[PDB]
Amino acid sequence: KKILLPEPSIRSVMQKYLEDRGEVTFEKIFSQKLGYLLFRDFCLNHLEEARPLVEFYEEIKKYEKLETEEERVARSREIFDSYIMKELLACSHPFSKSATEHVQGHLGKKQVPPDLFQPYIEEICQNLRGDVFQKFIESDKFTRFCQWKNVELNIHLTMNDFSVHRIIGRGGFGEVYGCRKADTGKMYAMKCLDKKRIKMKQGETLALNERIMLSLVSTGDCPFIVCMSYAFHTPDKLSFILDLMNGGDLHYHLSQHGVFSEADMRFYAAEIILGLEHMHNRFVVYRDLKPANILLDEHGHVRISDLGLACDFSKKKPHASVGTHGYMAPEVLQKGVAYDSSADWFSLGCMLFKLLRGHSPFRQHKTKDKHEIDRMTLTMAVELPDSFSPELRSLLEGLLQRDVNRRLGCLGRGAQEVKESPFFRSLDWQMVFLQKYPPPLIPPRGEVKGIKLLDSDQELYRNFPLTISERWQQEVAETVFDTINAETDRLEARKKAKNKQLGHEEDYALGKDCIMHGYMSKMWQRRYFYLFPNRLEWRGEGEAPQSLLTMEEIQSVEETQIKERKCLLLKIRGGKQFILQCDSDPELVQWKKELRDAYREAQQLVQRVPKMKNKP
Amino acid sequence: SIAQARKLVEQLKMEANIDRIKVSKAAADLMAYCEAHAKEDPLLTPVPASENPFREK
Amino acid sequence: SELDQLRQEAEQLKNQIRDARKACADATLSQITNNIDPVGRIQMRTRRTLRGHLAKIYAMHWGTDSRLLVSASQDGKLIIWDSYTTNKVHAIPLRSSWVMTCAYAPSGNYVACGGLDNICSIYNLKTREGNVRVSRELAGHTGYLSCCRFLDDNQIVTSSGDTTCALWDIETGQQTTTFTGHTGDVMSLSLAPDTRLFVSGACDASAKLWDVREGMCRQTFTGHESDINAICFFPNGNAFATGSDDATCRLFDLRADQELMTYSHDNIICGITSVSFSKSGRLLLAGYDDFNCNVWDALKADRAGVLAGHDNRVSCLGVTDDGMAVATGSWDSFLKIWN
Ligand SMILES: O=c1c2cc(-c3cn[nH]c3)ccc2ncn1Cc1ccccc1
């Protein structure tokens, strides 16, 4: 159940796979958490022409994370008259005059914004991209990166990969569980839908839309949204791996705690607003904003949950009337109405009102119609009970307008207008994002078949499986990454020293025209293959290759299925056939590509050669 | 264009300007060589296993 | 015009050359040799089987000691064998997999090879300290290297698909002389005993006699109806044989400046890939695409015997200097020593 890294020979395959997709650039590798970790390792330990540049870069990153201006004032000075400073400006590549002038300019006037050393950052990258990055690609640190990238691109999750615990919620299609991922031990929440009841109630339209919306949202590590890390499915289950929120929703806590005060409401509203600004920046409308979809964590902090009814308005505006009644804006409720993020600012006001009073501002007197609220949202203008404060009204008055042209957060700047309301005058939104404010309510611990699935319906969930690279790398980095590298390092040195004694010690794939090499299994027998321009050699352990297969001997390279496993089927001239099996998906893709290119090119070439080609 | 054509005729003139012997003469010299070395040819006359390095030496 | 007669003048010399040759055709080699006894039926057996190559064998070349021989294969390796023990003296992985030819220096100090890489690589066998590594990479040809032969340790001749041949100064690594003339891919070449001359066979269906020093073409031989894949000198150097895709071998005499004889049979339809004479020159051994090696009577043009021991094309062969054995290389990845 532990993670096992592929041998460093995996580089030969992975590097060609990544370069084909142009993933082998400074920006694409540096932007990755595991990529950065391995890059800084190489720069800080195996190349001092870039060590000081990386030290300074990390010092700037620490500075960027300081909350109070008090801290940044001191650290900015410390960093400037730091002697990592005149270790860069006193060597090969010093900072530009134009860059230093800006920094010491702001620094002298005693204003220290988090982006103070940003001019230095970009010049540092301009010095890392190129010769320094090329030395990294040649280093064995990039090799280790290929080993990790192989594991990531070969993730196939099952229920055996998780230790599922107690239930922590239920829906109309499935349940939610508290589970622990086996290889890392990270605590997750597993939302398991059931295709049986999904196809029954016509739900794959939501099940798919939720998976797509989560993809657009689960980036950036937003502390106020139940974001997805993984997505997979068994023969009967649709599974989302989400942020663990074992504290119950707000509708439950509302009916048990009673109505919240303005102070208690201001807390939830503040965190919910940041959760909305997140989606709206990624051009996503939630539309289903209600107390029931607000989950509390162990500490009382909240997140927006269930993105099943969200939408994308990046290129095409939504129109239809979707959402829960009483929380729907006039724009959406109005159909044929191109209505965008303005639909959530209305739902926010309706929701916050229910936290204060105990119900929707349009659902008065327990009414149960469904044209219900649609009458008062479009016609009437909800008028506060004067129990509220002048600022609370000034907010709800703006949020609950029918005009998008005159509503809070719809006149140009979006959420920044809502944060600006006199109701939030007392809040530091920086510390709201850091979740520094004390939650109003801390949850008590430990409480809160005649249908058939056809294959065509199973073909709806073809591309359901997904993996957020940002989430997985982050999970690995904060758990097993360092220790796994330690073991893998010494295990590789162990094999090397052994090969020293045995005596070789000299690579078979070097000094030649070898195109690619690595492990595969034939027929099963696991061998090490070497692909040349005119032949495919392979060997066992303990001697150089004694067998091979010429490119001219190969007729076709087709992918086939065997035991629910993808394999490469090589058709040989003599009516025979050669079947290969790769250890990972990336290897299957690259081998099929390199083999097709190889034999086609070789046969193309041999035909032009008198001594080599077949004659009458 | 014509510099190569000029090149060709100069080559033919050098190949044309050569002393040739009668085929009867040349054919006899070849036969005379074979006869004078027929005894030294192990592929012509199979040698004893004693003198054969690939059998018994 | 001025290209007017330069093509007509060229044709007339071709008539005169043909006329001069006809004037020398007073008799045939067949008529001259009717008195000597036939060689009888030539029959050999496999004394050795050299196992090691993983794919097709494309070429081989005997050492001067009539014991060591080098071979180039599709597996991208050169192997230097000890034909007496069949043991491998050297196994040399090459930088390029597309090797087509190999050569053994008369001194035994170096072996050469090349192919689609368009370069002739020299390998030092008796080393600096112990190993075996590339000592020189002869670059210059714009086509693939089809054949090469050492004049000595610092001079080697090469043929290429770039239509040309060339003499190289191994130390300097440049071409001392270029031999232009052919109009098709040069497939093979053979050094005269004196090493002052050498003949070449190309895909233009013609063989040419070259002067090594003056770097000129002295004589041109035609007759073949297709590609000449192999060529070899007659022991005394006054004649040479050729192998073609027309399923025929042919004997050319230099002093007569023409063809003397043709070696063929109506049963043989596949192309010849290699040719070589016995020590006395009485036998003409040739490799064929029908997996066979036919032994011809060089003087009487009869087929004396057939070496049949391969399951694929006989891509090359060679007779030792002492004339003790014949080596046959094949696409079956095997070399066999016949005796
Ligand atoms: O998504 C949820 C949900 C999520 C959590 C959760 C998130 N992270 N940790 C825990 C807790 C309770 C929940 N109850 C209902 N639904 C909607 C739903 C559920 C099932 C099927 C369809 C819709």
Side-chain angles (χ1 to χ4, degrees), chain B residues 11-12 15 20-24 29 35 37 41-43 52 54, chain C residues 10 23-24 26-27 36 48 217 220 255 257 278 280 323 326 339:
Chain B
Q11 175 60 17
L12 288 182
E15 298 183 7
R20 297 174 176 83
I21 68 177
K22 315 299 294 182
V23 173
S24 58
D29 288 338
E35 296 294 347
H37 293 281
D41 200 322
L43 294 181
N52 194 345
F54 297 93
Chain C
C24 296
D26 62 337
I36 62 181
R48 301 291 191 272
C217 180
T220 299
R255 293 172 297 170
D257 197 38
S278 59
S280 64
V326 182
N339 191 275

PDB file of all heavy atoms in Angstrom, chain B residues 11-12 15 20-24 29 35 37 41-43 52 54, chain C residues 10 23-24 26-27 36 48 217 220 255 257 278 280 323 326 339:
ATOM      1  N   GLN B  11      37.793  12.202 -71.201  1.00  0.00           N
ATOM      2  CA  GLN B  11      37.926  10.928 -70.505  1.00  0.00           C
ATOM      3  C   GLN B  11      37.922   9.768 -71.497  1.00  0.00           C
ATOM      4  O   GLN B  11      38.729   8.844 -71.389  1.00  0.00           O
ATOM      5  CB  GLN B  11      36.803  10.760 -69.477  1.00  0.00           C
ATOM      6  CG  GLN B  11      36.783   9.404 -68.785  1.00  0.00           C
ATOM      7  CD  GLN B  11      38.066   9.110 -68.031  1.00  0.00           C
ATOM      8  OE1 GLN B  11      38.853  10.012 -67.742  1.00  0.00           O
ATOM      9  NE2 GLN B  11      38.286   7.839 -67.714  1.00  0.00           N
ATOM     10  N   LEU B  12      37.016   9.824 -72.469  1.00  0.00           N
ATOM     11  CA  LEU B  12      36.924   8.784 -73.489  1.00  0.00           C
ATOM     12  C   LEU B  12      38.188   8.716 -74.337  1.00  0.00           C
ATOM     13  O   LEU B  12      38.594   7.639 -74.773  1.00  0.00           O
ATOM     14  CB  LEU B  12      35.708   9.016 -74.387  1.00  0.00           C
ATOM     15  CG  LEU B  12      34.350   8.729 -73.748  1.00  0.00           C
ATOM     16  CD1 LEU B  12      33.225   8.947 -74.749  1.00  0.00           C
ATOM     17  CD2 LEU B  12      34.321   7.313 -73.206  1.00  0.00           C
ATOM     18  N   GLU B  15      40.722   6.875 -72.360  1.00  0.00           N
ATOM     19  CA  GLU B  15      40.379   5.459 -72.287  1.00  0.00           C
ATOM     20  C   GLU B  15      40.542   4.792 -73.647  1.00  0.00           C
ATOM     21  O   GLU B  15      40.855   3.606 -73.733  1.00  0.00           O
ATOM     22  CB  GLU B  15      38.950   5.277 -71.774  1.00  0.00           C
ATOM     23  CG  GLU B  15      38.729   5.816 -70.368  1.00  0.00           C
ATOM     24  CD  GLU B  15      37.325   5.557 -69.854  1.00  0.00           C
ATOM     25  OE1 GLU B  15      36.564   4.838 -70.535  1.00  0.00           O
ATOM     26  OE2 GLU B  15      36.982   6.072 -68.768  1.00  0.00           O
ATOM     27  N   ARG B  20      46.144  -2.369 -76.299  1.00  0.00           N
ATOM     28  CA  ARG B  20      45.372  -3.577 -76.049  1.00  0.00           C
ATOM     29  C   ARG B  20      46.055  -4.801 -76.643  1.00  0.00           C
ATOM     30  O   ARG B  20      46.600  -4.744 -77.745  1.00  0.00           O
ATOM     31  CB  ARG B  20      43.964  -3.441 -76.626  1.00  0.00           C
ATOM     32  CG  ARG B  20      43.144  -2.338 -75.996  1.00  0.00           C
ATOM     33  CD  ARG B  20      41.824  -2.166 -76.721  1.00  0.00           C
ATOM     34  NE  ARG B  20      40.984  -1.163 -76.078  1.00  0.00           N
ATOM     35  CZ  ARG B  20      41.090   0.143 -76.292  1.00  0.00           C
ATOM     36  NH1 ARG B  20      42.005   0.608 -77.133  1.00  0.00           N
ATOM     37  NH2 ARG B  20      40.283   0.987 -75.663  1.00  0.00           N
ATOM     38  N   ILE B  21      46.022  -5.905 -75.907  1.00  0.00           N
ATOM     39  CA  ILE B  21      46.584  -7.151 -76.398  1.00  0.00           C
ATOM     40  C   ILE B  21      45.476  -8.060 -76.915  1.00  0.00           C
ATOM     41  O   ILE B  21      44.302  -7.853 -76.612  1.00  0.00           O
ATOM     42  CB  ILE B  21      47.385  -7.881 -75.308  1.00  0.00           C
ATOM     43  CG1 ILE B  21      46.454  -8.387 -74.203  1.00  0.00           C
ATOM     44  CG2 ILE B  21      48.452  -6.967 -74.734  1.00  0.00           C
ATOM     45  CD1 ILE B  21      47.163  -9.187 -73.128  1.00  0.00           C
ATOM     46  N   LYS B  22      45.857  -9.060 -77.702  1.00  0.00           N
ATOM     47  CA  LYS B  22      44.899 -10.027 -78.227  1.00  0.00           C
ATOM     48  C   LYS B  22      44.307 -10.851 -77.086  1.00  0.00           C
ATOM     49  O   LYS B  22      45.009 -11.199 -76.135  1.00  0.00           O
ATOM     50  CB  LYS B  22      45.566 -10.943 -79.257  1.00  0.00           C
ATOM     51  CG  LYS B  22      46.454 -10.223 -80.267  1.00  0.00           C
ATOM     52  CD  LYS B  22      45.673  -9.213 -81.097  1.00  0.00           C
ATOM     53  CE  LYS B  22      44.646  -9.892 -81.990  1.00  0.00           C
ATOM     54  NZ  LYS B  22      43.923  -8.909 -82.842  1.00  0.00           N
ATOM     55  N   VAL B  23      43.016 -11.157 -77.182  1.00  0.00           N
ATOM     56  CA  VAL B  23      42.331 -11.956 -76.167  1.00  0.00           C
ATOM     57  C   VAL B  23      42.953 -13.341 -76.034  1.00  0.00           C
ATOM     58  O   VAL B  23      42.965 -13.926 -74.952  1.00  0.00           O
ATOM     59  CB  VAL B  23      40.832 -12.110 -76.488  1.00  0.00           C
ATOM     60  CG1 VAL B  23      40.177 -13.090 -75.525  1.00  0.00           C
ATOM     61  CG2 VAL B  23      40.138 -10.755 -76.442  1.00  0.00           C
ATOM     62  N   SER B  24      43.467 -13.859 -77.145  1.00  0.00           N
ATOM     63  CA  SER B  24      44.145 -15.145 -77.147  1.00  0.00           C
ATOM     64  C   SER B  24      45.368 -15.092 -76.241  1.00  0.00           C
ATOM     65  O   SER B  24      45.651 -16.034 -75.502  1.00  0.00           O
ATOM     66  CB  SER B  24      44.549 -15.536 -78.567  1.00  0.00           C
ATOM     67  OG  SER B  24      45.395 -14.554 -79.139  1.00  0.00           O
ATOM     68  N   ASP B  29      47.634 -16.315 -70.699  1.00  0.00           N
ATOM     69  CA  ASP B  29      48.359 -15.900 -69.502  1.00  0.00           C
ATOM     70  C   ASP B  29      47.598 -16.293 -68.242  1.00  0.00           C
ATOM     71  O   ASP B  29      48.195 -16.720 -67.253  1.00  0.00           O
ATOM     72  CB  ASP B  29      48.615 -14.391 -69.513  1.00  0.00           C
ATOM     73  CG  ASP B  29      49.661 -13.983 -70.532  1.00  0.00           C
ATOM     74  OD1 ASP B  29      50.474 -14.846 -70.932  1.00  0.00           O
ATOM     75  OD2 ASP B  29      49.676 -12.798 -70.929  1.00  0.00           O
ATOM     76  N   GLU B  35      47.550 -22.928 -63.905  1.00  0.00           N
ATOM     77  CA  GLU B  35      48.296 -24.178 -63.975  1.00  0.00           C
ATOM     78  C   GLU B  35      49.533 -24.140 -63.085  1.00  0.00           C
ATOM     79  O   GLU B  35      49.900 -25.143 -62.476  1.00  0.00           O
ATOM     80  CB  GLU B  35      48.701 -24.480 -65.419  1.00  0.00           C
ATOM     81  CG  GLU B  35      47.529 -24.711 -66.362  1.00  0.00           C
ATOM     82  CD  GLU B  35      46.740 -25.959 -66.018  1.00  0.00           C
ATOM     83  OE1 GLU B  35      47.234 -26.774 -65.211  1.00  0.00           O
ATOM     84  OE2 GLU B  35      45.624 -26.122 -66.553  1.00  0.00           O
ATOM     85  N   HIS B  37      49.889 -22.654 -60.365  1.00  0.00           N
ATOM     86  CA  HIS B  37      49.528 -22.488 -58.961  1.00  0.00           C
ATOM     87  C   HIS B  37      48.419 -23.447 -58.541  1.00  0.00           C
ATOM     88  O   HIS B  37      47.865 -23.326 -57.448  1.00  0.00           O
ATOM     89  CB  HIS B  37      49.096 -21.045 -58.687  1.00  0.00           C
ATOM     90  CG  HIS B  37      50.201 -20.044 -58.832  1.00  0.00           C
ATOM     91  ND1 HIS B  37      51.154 -19.843 -57.857  1.00  0.00           N
ATOM     92  CD2 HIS B  37      50.500 -19.183 -59.833  1.00  0.00           C
ATOM     93  CE1 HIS B  37      51.995 -18.905 -58.253  1.00  0.00           C
ATOM     94  NE2 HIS B  37      51.621 -18.488 -59.450  1.00  0.00           N
ATOM     95  N   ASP B  41      46.539 -24.570 -54.353  1.00  0.00           N
ATOM     96  CA  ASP B  41      45.141 -24.249 -54.092  1.00  0.00           C
ATOM     97  C   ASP B  41      44.443 -25.365 -53.316  1.00  0.00           C
ATOM     98  O   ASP B  41      44.093 -26.400 -53.886  1.00  0.00           O
ATOM     99  CB  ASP B  41      44.409 -23.981 -55.410  1.00  0.00           C
ATOM    100  CG  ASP B  41      43.136 -23.182 -55.219  1.00  0.00           C
ATOM    101  OD1 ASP B  41      42.429 -23.408 -54.216  1.00  0.00           O
ATOM    102  OD2 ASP B  41      42.844 -22.322 -56.077  1.00  0.00           O
ATOM    103  N   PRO B  42      44.238 -25.152 -52.006  1.00  0.00           N
ATOM    104  CA  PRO B  42      43.597 -26.123 -51.111  1.00  0.00           C
ATOM    105  C   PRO B  42      42.112 -26.327 -51.410  1.00  0.00           C
ATOM    106  O   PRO B  42      41.542 -27.345 -51.015  1.00  0.00           O
ATOM    107  CB  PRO B  42      43.789 -25.500 -49.721  1.00  0.00           C
ATOM    108  CG  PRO B  42      44.893 -24.497 -49.887  1.00  0.00           C
ATOM    109  CD  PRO B  42      44.727 -23.973 -51.275  1.00  0.00           C
ATOM    110  N   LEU B  43      41.492 -25.366 -52.089  1.00  0.00           N
ATOM    111  CA  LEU B  43      40.085 -25.479 -52.459  1.00  0.00           C
ATOM    112  C   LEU B  43      39.937 -26.270 -53.749  1.00  0.00           C
ATOM    113  O   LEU B  43      38.884 -26.845 -54.026  1.00  0.00           O
ATOM    114  CB  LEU B  43      39.453 -24.098 -52.618  1.00  0.00           C
ATOM    115  CG  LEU B  43      39.340 -23.261 -51.346  1.00  0.00           C
ATOM    116  CD1 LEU B  43      38.683 -21.931 -51.658  1.00  0.00           C
ATOM    117  CD2 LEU B  43      38.563 -24.012 -50.278  1.00  0.00           C
ATOM    118  N   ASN B  52      45.295 -29.384 -42.636  1.00  0.00           N
ATOM    119  CA  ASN B  52      44.101 -28.558 -42.525  1.00  0.00           C
ATOM    120  C   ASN B  52      43.932 -28.016 -41.108  1.00  0.00           C
ATOM    121  O   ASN B  52      43.732 -28.782 -40.166  1.00  0.00           O
ATOM    122  CB  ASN B  52      42.865 -29.359 -42.935  1.00  0.00           C
ATOM    123  CG  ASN B  52      41.648 -28.483 -43.165  1.00  0.00           C
ATOM    124  OD1 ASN B  52      41.614 -27.321 -42.760  1.00  0.00           O
ATOM    125  ND2 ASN B  52      40.637 -29.042 -43.817  1.00  0.00           N
ATOM    126  N   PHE B  54      41.488 -26.413 -39.965  1.00  0.00           N
ATOM    127  CA  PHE B  54      40.098 -26.529 -39.548  1.00  0.00           C
ATOM    128  C   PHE B  54      39.682 -27.987 -39.346  1.00  0.00           C
ATOM    129  O   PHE B  54      38.497 -28.285 -39.187  1.00  0.00           O
ATOM    130  CB  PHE B  54      39.181 -25.854 -40.572  1.00  0.00           C
ATOM    131  CG  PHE B  54      39.416 -24.375 -40.714  1.00  0.00           C
ATOM    132  CD1 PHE B  54      40.286 -23.886 -41.675  1.00  0.00           C
ATOM    133  CD2 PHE B  54      38.768 -23.473 -39.883  1.00  0.00           C
ATOM    134  CE1 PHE B  54      40.504 -22.528 -41.805  1.00  0.00           C
ATOM    135  CE2 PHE B  54      38.985 -22.113 -40.010  1.00  0.00           C
ATOM    136  CZ  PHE B  54      39.853 -21.641 -40.973  1.00  0.00           C
TER     137      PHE B  54
ATOM    138  N   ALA C  10      31.759  12.170 -78.725  1.00  0.00           N
ATOM    139  CA  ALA C  10      31.789  11.220 -77.621  1.00  0.00           C
ATOM    140  C   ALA C  10      31.327   9.840 -78.080  1.00  0.00           C
ATOM    141  O   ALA C  10      31.838   8.817 -77.625  1.00  0.00           O
ATOM    142  CB  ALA C  10      30.926  11.714 -76.471  1.00  0.00           C
ATOM    143  N   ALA C  23      38.779  -5.757 -82.409  1.00  0.00           N
ATOM    144  CA  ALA C  23      39.999  -6.078 -83.137  1.00  0.00           C
ATOM    145  C   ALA C  23      40.885  -7.029 -82.338  1.00  0.00           C
ATOM    146  O   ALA C  23      41.686  -7.770 -82.908  1.00  0.00           O
ATOM    147  CB  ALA C  23      40.758  -4.806 -83.480  1.00  0.00           C
ATOM    148  N   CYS C  24      40.733  -7.006 -81.017  1.00  0.00           N
ATOM    149  CA  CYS C  24      41.523  -7.861 -80.138  1.00  0.00           C
ATOM    150  C   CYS C  24      40.814  -9.177 -79.838  1.00  0.00           C
ATOM    151  O   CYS C  24      41.403 -10.090 -79.257  1.00  0.00           O
ATOM    152  CB  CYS C  24      41.841  -7.138 -78.827  1.00  0.00           C
ATOM    153  SG  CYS C  24      42.875  -5.671 -79.007  1.00  0.00           S
ATOM    154  N   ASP C  26      40.260 -12.087 -81.027  1.00  0.00           N
ATOM    155  CA  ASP C  26      40.673 -13.077 -82.017  1.00  0.00           C
ATOM    156  C   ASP C  26      40.315 -14.492 -81.572  1.00  0.00           C
ATOM    157  O   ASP C  26      40.320 -15.427 -82.374  1.00  0.00           O
ATOM    158  CB  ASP C  26      42.178 -12.974 -82.283  1.00  0.00           C
ATOM    159  CG  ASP C  26      43.012 -13.258 -81.047  1.00  0.00           C
ATOM    160  OD1 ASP C  26      42.491 -13.100 -79.924  1.00  0.00           O
ATOM    161  OD2 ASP C  26      44.191 -13.635 -81.196  1.00  0.00           O
ATOM    162  N   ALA C  27      40.007 -14.642 -80.288  1.00  0.00           N
ATOM    163  CA  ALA C  27      39.656 -15.939 -79.728  1.00  0.00           C
ATOM    164  C   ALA C  27      38.975 -15.769 -78.375  1.00  0.00           C
ATOM    165  O   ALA C  27      38.954 -14.673 -77.818  1.00  0.00           O
ATOM    166  CB  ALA C  27      40.893 -16.812 -79.597  1.00  0.00           C
ATOM    167  N   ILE C  36      42.439 -28.317 -71.131  1.00  0.00           N
ATOM    168  CA  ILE C  36      42.687 -28.651 -69.734  1.00  0.00           C
ATOM    169  C   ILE C  36      41.504 -29.397 -69.124  1.00  0.00           C
ATOM    170  O   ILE C  36      40.350 -29.143 -69.467  1.00  0.00           O
ATOM    171  CB  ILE C  36      42.987 -27.395 -68.899  1.00  0.00           C
ATOM    172  CG1 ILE C  36      41.792 -26.445 -68.906  1.00  0.00           C
ATOM    173  CG2 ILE C  36      44.228 -26.689 -69.420  1.00  0.00           C
ATOM    174  CD1 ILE C  36      42.027 -25.176 -68.122  1.00  0.00           C
ATOM    175  N   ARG C  48      33.278 -24.845 -39.518  1.00  0.00           N
ATOM    176  CA  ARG C  48      32.995 -23.926 -38.418  1.00  0.00           C
ATOM    177  C   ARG C  48      31.680 -23.187 -38.619  1.00  0.00           C
ATOM    178  O   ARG C  48      31.304 -22.862 -39.745  1.00  0.00           O
ATOM    179  CB  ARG C  48      34.124 -22.906 -38.265  1.00  0.00           C
ATOM    180  CG  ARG C  48      35.489 -23.503 -37.998  1.00  0.00           C
ATOM    181  CD  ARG C  48      35.568 -24.120 -36.615  1.00  0.00           C
ATOM    182  NE  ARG C  48      36.943 -24.461 -36.268  1.00  0.00           N
ATOM    183  CZ  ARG C  48      37.521 -25.621 -36.559  1.00  0.00           C
ATOM    184  NH1 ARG C  48      36.838 -26.561 -37.199  1.00  0.00           N
ATOM    185  NH2 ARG C  48      38.779 -25.842 -36.208  1.00  0.00           N
ATOM    186  N   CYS C 217      40.396   7.653 -63.981  1.00  0.00           N
ATOM    187  CA  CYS C 217      39.804   6.431 -64.507  1.00  0.00           C
ATOM    188  C   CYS C 217      40.538   6.031 -65.780  1.00  0.00           C
ATOM    189  O   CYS C 217      40.646   6.823 -66.717  1.00  0.00           O
ATOM    190  CB  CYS C 217      38.310   6.612 -64.784  1.00  0.00           C
ATOM    191  SG  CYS C 217      37.497   5.136 -65.455  1.00  0.00           S
ATOM    192  N   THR C 220      36.971   1.487 -68.596  1.00  0.00           N
ATOM    193  CA  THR C 220      35.589   1.264 -68.189  1.00  0.00           C
ATOM    194  C   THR C 220      35.045  -0.016 -68.811  1.00  0.00           C
ATOM    195  O   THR C 220      35.164  -0.231 -70.018  1.00  0.00           O
ATOM    196  CB  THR C 220      34.684   2.443 -68.581  1.00  0.00           C
ATOM    197  OG1 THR C 220      35.142   3.634 -67.930  1.00  0.00           O
ATOM    198  CG2 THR C 220      33.243   2.170 -68.174  1.00  0.00           C
ATOM    199  N   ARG C 255      44.351  -5.992 -69.916  1.00  0.00           N
ATOM    200  CA  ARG C 255      45.206  -5.781 -71.081  1.00  0.00           C
ATOM    201  C   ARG C 255      44.453  -5.969 -72.393  1.00  0.00           C
ATOM    202  O   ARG C 255      44.845  -5.430 -73.427  1.00  0.00           O
ATOM    203  CB  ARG C 255      46.410  -6.718 -71.031  1.00  0.00           C
ATOM    204  CG  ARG C 255      47.370  -6.418 -69.900  1.00  0.00           C
ATOM    205  CD  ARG C 255      48.421  -7.501 -69.792  1.00  0.00           C
ATOM    206  NE  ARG C 255      47.820  -8.790 -69.467  1.00  0.00           N
ATOM    207  CZ  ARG C 255      48.474  -9.945 -69.492  1.00  0.00           C
ATOM    208  NH1 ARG C 255      49.755  -9.973 -69.833  1.00  0.00           N
ATOM    209  NH2 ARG C 255      47.844 -11.071 -69.182  1.00  0.00           N
ATOM    210  N   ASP C 257      41.170  -5.266 -72.371  1.00  0.00           N
ATOM    211  CA  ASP C 257      40.180  -4.203 -72.231  1.00  0.00           C
ATOM    212  C   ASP C 257      38.780  -4.667 -72.628  1.00  0.00           C
ATOM    213  O   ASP C 257      38.090  -3.993 -73.394  1.00  0.00           O
ATOM    214  CB  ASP C 257      40.581  -2.986 -73.068  1.00  0.00           C
ATOM    215  CG  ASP C 257      39.834  -1.726 -72.663  1.00  0.00           C
ATOM    216  OD1 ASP C 257      39.610  -1.532 -71.448  1.00  0.00           O
ATOM    217  OD2 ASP C 257      39.467  -0.934 -73.557  1.00  0.00           O
ATOM    218  N   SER C 278      39.631 -18.428 -55.740  1.00  0.00           N
ATOM    219  CA  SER C 278      40.492 -19.297 -54.953  1.00  0.00           C
ATOM    220  C   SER C 278      41.928 -18.804 -55.097  1.00  0.00           C
ATOM    221  O   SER C 278      42.200 -17.916 -55.907  1.00  0.00           O
ATOM    222  CB  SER C 278      40.363 -20.755 -55.397  1.00  0.00           C
ATOM    223  OG  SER C 278      40.702 -20.906 -56.764  1.00  0.00           O
ATOM    224  N   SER C 280      44.568 -20.004 -56.446  1.00  0.00           N
ATOM    225  CA  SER C 280      45.154 -20.171 -57.773  1.00  0.00           C
ATOM    226  C   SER C 280      44.345 -19.429 -58.832  1.00  0.00           C
ATOM    227  O   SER C 280      44.786 -19.276 -59.971  1.00  0.00           O
ATOM    228  CB  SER C 280      45.258 -21.654 -58.136  1.00  0.00           C
ATOM    229  OG  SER C 280      43.975 -22.249 -58.240  1.00  0.00           O
ATOM    230  N   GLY C 323      44.518 -19.698 -48.803  1.00  0.00           N
ATOM    231  CA  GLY C 323      43.584 -20.455 -49.618  1.00  0.00           C
ATOM    232  C   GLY C 323      43.039 -21.696 -48.935  1.00  0.00           C
ATOM    233  O   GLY C 323      42.549 -22.611 -49.597  1.00  0.00           O
ATOM    234  N   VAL C 326      36.963 -21.013 -47.161  1.00  0.00           N
ATOM    235  CA  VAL C 326      36.053 -19.969 -47.613  1.00  0.00           C
ATOM    236  C   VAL C 326      35.038 -19.659 -46.520  1.00  0.00           C
ATOM    237  O   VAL C 326      34.456 -20.568 -45.929  1.00  0.00           O
ATOM    238  CB  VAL C 326      35.300 -20.375 -48.892  1.00  0.00           C
ATOM    239  CG1 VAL C 326      34.398 -19.240 -49.358  1.00  0.00           C
ATOM    240  CG2 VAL C 326      36.276 -20.770 -49.982  1.00  0.00           C
ATOM    241  N   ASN C 339      35.353 -25.953 -46.176  1.00  0.00           N
ATOM    242  CA  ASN C 339      36.657 -26.536 -46.455  1.00  0.00           C
ATOM    243  C   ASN C 339      36.558 -27.904 -47.123  1.00  0.00           C
ATOM    244  O   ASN C 339      35.686 -28.709 -46.801  1.00  0.00           O
ATOM    245  CB  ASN C 339      37.458 -26.644 -45.157  1.00  0.00           C
ATOM    246  CG  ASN C 339      38.908 -26.988 -45.396  1.00  0.00           C
ATOM    247  OD1 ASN C 339      39.269 -28.157 -45.523  1.00  0.00           O
ATOM    248  ND2 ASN C 339      39.755 -25.967 -45.459  1.00  0.00           N
TER     249      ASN C 339
END
